[PDB]
């Protein structure tokens, strides 16, 4: 395995938004995550394409589908990124 | 500022501290030499790399004090922080307080427990379930912490008994169920089951760098061949199932008469064949099994000594311990998720209060909330800093904060103050670490507000949350009974004395010093290594004088046996109102039933009486007529009513008690005998005649008049006195038995058990002894037995002393062991004259 | 005595003489009323003297 | 060694001391704060190390890992799954150090 899914890993229980192939973009706490991309989240603040804001609480993203996370900004100070 | 090299950087752990679910609070604890500061070395240099083990001596990075490197022993409990991974390589922020595991230094555990979540109990593999292990579970139980229980030395079972890997398997096992067992005995939980199999059982070895848990182990196995599921395969290395080869699949019975455990077969014969081709093969075949476990060693590591190549081997073999920080993880709650028993069982007012509701979130901003339990010193002694958790809210470094005692209330509002902070500091053992702001759910170092902490404190903010309560206070495990007088040898220098003497008050929670009325200093104990320690640290950091001290008493009590031969009158001096009371003893188990909140006032009335009407069997009559019990708000003295609503008017009698009362409290506490506290007493008001006018119902006429009521009664009732009964465990050679029944027999005490211990051939006894005749006892059998045996003292009860206490016929010649009948009047007399009372106390005197 | 002379330490025990040559049960025993009556006693023959003619 | 005078007090009064057991040298040296006026040079005694239960080999001819009866017996006596959900080790895989 090697360092993003580490650091995936990492951002666990922290507050991430991910946006998959629907266009559609996930706020809200990272729960689990595993070595491929598939990422169980709750707390979930939605935005569609059209811009309808939803509130999901409990979410599973299948990583086949997702074009990107974006992260908090205090890990890079994680010990595999130094 | 300076620090040592660390592996995380520092603003990780800096921002690790902001997420309330990444964070545990984790108290380690245990019996006396299992192993706990061992296992906080082998963190602190998984940690840090330039700090490492000597060859020839332990670390002890976490011993910090001079005493605890002198005498071997832990005195004080420390903290540390550290950011750790675990398995799947998620980091991690503990908080790990190490607790000394001496049962005269258990007061040091309950000031860790307070500010902790969760409880890791150490246990010998060798020796197994001692004395302070059984009372730590109890007591980590009663005060609603998660457990989990780590069998350490194990190593023991392979280098020393040189034992078969069934019996150790079977050693192991009998140690799981006698924790599952004690953990059963005081829980009404069920879901409380140890078992490796849940996660929730480790297994270590400190002094070469041992540790795993089963998913650990099954980690090792899917590193080295690969394509095995970890979390599957570590479910089935424990119990009775086993390996069939043919099939390659865990069936539930034997293929072979052969066949070993899972655990065997899998985990305990590896450890076995490493340790033996470190031990004993070294110089024909470790290189080939080096070269099959797939570690590599220079040729200078090959050349070291046993122990230090073992610890090496094992530590490039298991590596990190990650199974610790699983079961942490695990089986201990967050503080964002434990908040809510935390504020139901600590917090004064009940979690249901409008602050409650604000603390069980774990917010950390909004209502400042820290509770402080510990006062550490520094380099020079001339100031402390508070040390606790923070409940709710950021603490600040400059931040003006308001200080709470434990005598504060919403009422009277006079135990407070308002201070300044100077610093903020997280701990590490030997350095600290300072920051600036200190969030909710961690733990805090605070400097100065040290001025009016005694034991415990609230930091609360000045201006806002108007209703705020303090915490409870520290509920010890155990009575300190031993009594000490203090004097300085230069009589000028008392001012010095007494800077010294409310410094070590603070340092030590369950120390109690008190002025007598004669002008002697008295500090109360709970052993000899303890008051040995406070001497230490009195003179040698906060006197720097000379102090006699003399020879060591206990603590007196004062009791009744016979039903009072009459009934006893006493009127007020405005000869208005006139008080009858008749004294009788409560019942076998009734007192340890108060003493332990089985019973309990502020019930409405209801199940209170059922309790006496069901269990001890009292008559309505007599179970709806309690008014107050204790001298302290749950002691074991009740002031019990059999005035007739015929002969007296009960809605005018229900005026004077709450005088009465405080009566009762005022003179249940200093008896008249010697000035102790009563045990065991029912005081009954037969007859009663009240004043009319309310200006003779005053409280200055009536409680001196009640206190002299419930002396009377307690004189004519046959007055004795109590003294404190010790148990002893010993744990010794099976040829030193004789020698210890030998030297247990000339100090007035008796052998309850001598019980074997199983997969070792030392034996246990344990016995009760009168604590006037524990000094010197530890260092009886430790001469008598060639130094084989040990003993540890605890408190457990109170039995009556025999003799006469009011037998005036007596006459005791001085410097002379005095036998049995004699006992009573020589402790009463010889405490009147150390206390500074009359040379006697008369039948008729009140 | 004590009105003049305040104790508040228990400093006169220290500065009593006393006889070493008999044992220690043998002389005498320095209770503290004793010591404030043997105090006492020599305060009040010292008060009956001027300075200037004679001193104790 | 050769070494490196009190009156009566209120402090050692006899008649407040109850004297049960007599206090010897060992006491005073064992705990040297608790029992010795003036206790200038003295030095900390190690307090204690758990007992080594080894046990020496006196033949050469038994197992090195042999169940001695000096040591005391063990008395004899759990969540465990099912035999029907299979879980299937690789074949190459083999407990550690087998040879
Ligand atoms: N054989 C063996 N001895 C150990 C092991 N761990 C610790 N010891 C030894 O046992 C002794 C006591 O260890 P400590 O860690 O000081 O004991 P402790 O639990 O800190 O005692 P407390 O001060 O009560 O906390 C030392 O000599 C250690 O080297 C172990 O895994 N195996
Ligand atoms: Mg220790």
Not at chain 2, 167 to 192: C, F, P, Q, W
Not at chain 2, 534 to 562: G, N, Q
């Amino acid at each position: 395995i090697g360092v993003p899914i580490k650091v995936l890993h990492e951002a666990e229980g922290h507050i991430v938004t991910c946006e998959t192939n629907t266009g559609e973009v996930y706020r809200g706490k990272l729960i689990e995550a595993e070595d491929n991309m598939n990422c169980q989240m709750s707390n979930i603040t939605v935005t569609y394409r059209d811009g309808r804001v939803a509130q999901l609480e409990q979410v599973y993203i299948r990583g086949s589908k997702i074009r990107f996370l974006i992260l908090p900004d205090m890990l890079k100070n994680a010990p595999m990124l130094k | 500022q300076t620090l040592p090299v660390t592996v995380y950087e520092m603003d990780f752990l800096a921002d690790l501290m902001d997420n309330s679910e990444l964070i545990r609070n984790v108290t380690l604890c245990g019996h006396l030499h299992h192993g706990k500061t061992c296992f906080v070395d082998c963190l602190i240099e998984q940690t840090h790399p330039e700090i490492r083990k000597r060859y020839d001596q332990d670390l002890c990075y976490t011993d910090i004090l001079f005493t605890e490197q002198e005498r071997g022993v832990g005195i004080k409990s420390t903290p540390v922080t550290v950011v750790l991974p675990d398995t799947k390589g998620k980091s991690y922020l503990f908080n790990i307080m190490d607790t000394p595991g001496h049962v005269n230094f258990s007061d040091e555990v309950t000031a860790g427990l307070r500010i902790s979540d969760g409880v890791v109990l150490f246990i010998d593999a060798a020796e197994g379930v001692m004395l302070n292990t059984e009372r730590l579970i109890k007591h980590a139980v009663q005060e609603r912490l998660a457990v989990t229980v780590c069998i350490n030395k194990i190593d023991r079972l392979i280098l020393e008994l040189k034992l078969p890997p069934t019996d150790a398997y079977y050693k192991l096992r009998h140690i799981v169920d006698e924790v599952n067992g004690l953990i059963s005995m005081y829980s009404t939980d069920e879901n409380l089951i140890l078992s490796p199999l849940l996660g929730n059982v480790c297994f270590s070895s400190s002094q070469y760098s041992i540790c795993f848990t089963l998913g650990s182990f099954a980690k090792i196995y899917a590193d080295t061949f690969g394509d095995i599921n970890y979390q599957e395969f570590a479910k089935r290395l424990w119990g009775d199932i086993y390996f069939n080869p043919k099939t390659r699949k865990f069936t539930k019975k034997a293929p072979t008469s052969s066949s070993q455990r899972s655990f065997v077969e899998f985990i305990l014969e590896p450890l076995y064949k490493i340790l033996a081709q470190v031990v004993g093969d070294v110089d024909t075949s470790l290189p080939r099994t080096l070269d099959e476990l797939g570690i590599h060693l220079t040729k200078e590591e090959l050349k070291l000594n046993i122990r230090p190549l073992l610890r090496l081997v094992c530590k490039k073999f298991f590596g990190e311990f990650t199974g610790f920080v699983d079961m942490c993880v695990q089986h201990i709650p967050s503080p964002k998720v434990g908040a809510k028993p935390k504020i139901e069982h600590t917090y004064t007012g009940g979690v249901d209060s409008d602050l409650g509701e604000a603390m069980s979130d774990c917010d950390p901003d909004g209502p400042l909330m820290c509770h402080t339990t510990k006062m550490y010193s520094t380099d020079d002694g001339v100031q402390f800093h508070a040390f606790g958790r923070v409940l709710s809210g950021t603490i600040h470094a400059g931040q003006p904060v308001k200080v709470l005692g434990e005598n504060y209330t919403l009422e009277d509002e006079e135990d407070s103050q308002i201070c300044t902070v100077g610093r903020l500091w997280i701990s590490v053992a030997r350095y600290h670490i300072e920051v600036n702001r200190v969030p909710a759910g961690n733990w805090v170092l605070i400097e100065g507000v040290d001025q009016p902490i005694v034991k415990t404190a609230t930091i609360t903010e000045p201006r806002g949350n108007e209703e705020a309560q303090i915490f409870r206070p520290l509920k010890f495990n155990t009575t300190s009974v031993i009594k000490i007088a203090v004097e300085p040898v230069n009589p000028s220098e008392l001012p010095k004395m007494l800077d010294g003497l409310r410094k070590v008050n603070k340092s030590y929670p369950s120390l109690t010093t008190k002025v007598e009325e004669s002008g002697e200093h008295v500090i109360l104990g709970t052993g000899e290594l303890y008051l040995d320690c406070v001497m230490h640290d009195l003179r040698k950091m906060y006197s720097e004088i000379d102090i006699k001290v003399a020879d060591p008493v206990v603590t007196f009590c004062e009791t009744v046996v016979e039903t009072s031969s009459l009934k006893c009158f006493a009127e007020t001096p405005n000869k208005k109102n006139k008080i009858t009371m008749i004294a009788e003893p409560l019942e076998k188990g009734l007192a340890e039933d108060i003493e332990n909140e089985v019973v309990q006032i502020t019930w409405n009335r209801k199940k209170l009486g059922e309790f006496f009407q069901t269990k001890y069997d009292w008559d309505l009559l007599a179970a709806r007529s309690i008014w107050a019990f204790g001298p302290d708000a749950t002691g074991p003295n009740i002031l019990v009513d059999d005035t007739l609503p015929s002969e007296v008017d009960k809605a005018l009698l229900g005026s004077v008690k709450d005088s009465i009362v405080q009566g009762f409290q005022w003179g249940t506490r200093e008896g008249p005998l010697c000035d102790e506290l009563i045990r065991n007493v029912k005081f009954k008001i037969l007859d009663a005649v009240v004043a009319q006018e309310p200006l003779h119902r005053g409280g200055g006429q009536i409680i001196p008049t009640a206190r002299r009521v419930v002396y009377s009664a307690f004189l004519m009732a046959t007055p004795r006195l109590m003294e404190p009964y010790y148990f002893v465990e010993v744990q010794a050679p099976a040829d030193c038995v004789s020698a210890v029944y030998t030297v247990l027999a000339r100090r007035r005490g008796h052998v309850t058990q001598d019980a074997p211990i199983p997969g070792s051939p030392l034996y246990t006894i344990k016995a009760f002894i009168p604590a006037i005749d524990s000094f010197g006892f530890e260092t009886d059998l430790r001469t008598h037995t060639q130094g084989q045996a040990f003993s540890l003292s605890v408190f457990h009860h109170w039995q009556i002393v025999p003799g006469d206490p009011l037998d005036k016929s007596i006459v005791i010649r001085p410097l002379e062991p005095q036998p049995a009948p004699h006992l009573a009047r020589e402790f009463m007399i010889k405490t009147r004259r150390r206390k500074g009372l009359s040379e006697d106390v008369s039948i008729s005197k009140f | 005595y004590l009105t003049e002379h305040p104790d508040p330490n228990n400093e006169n025990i220290v500065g009593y003489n006393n006889k070493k040559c008999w044992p220690r049960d043998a002389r005498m025993r320095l209770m503290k009323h004793d010591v404030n009556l043997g105090r006492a006693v020599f305060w009040d023959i010292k008060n009956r003297l001027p300075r200037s003619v004679t001193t104790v | 060694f050769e070494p490196l005078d009190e009156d009566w007090n209120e402090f050692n009064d006899i008649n407040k001391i109850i004297i049960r057991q007599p206090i010897r040298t060992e006491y005073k040296i064992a705990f040297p704060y608790l029992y010795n006026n003036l206790p200038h040079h003295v030095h900390l005694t190690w307090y204690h190390t758990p007992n080594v239960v080894f046990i020496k080999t006196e033949d050469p001819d038994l197992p090195a890992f042999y169940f001695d009866p000096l040591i005391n017996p063990i008395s004899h006596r759990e969540p465990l799954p099912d035999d029907d959900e299979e879980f299937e080790l690789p074949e190459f895989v083999e407990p550690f150090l087998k040879d």
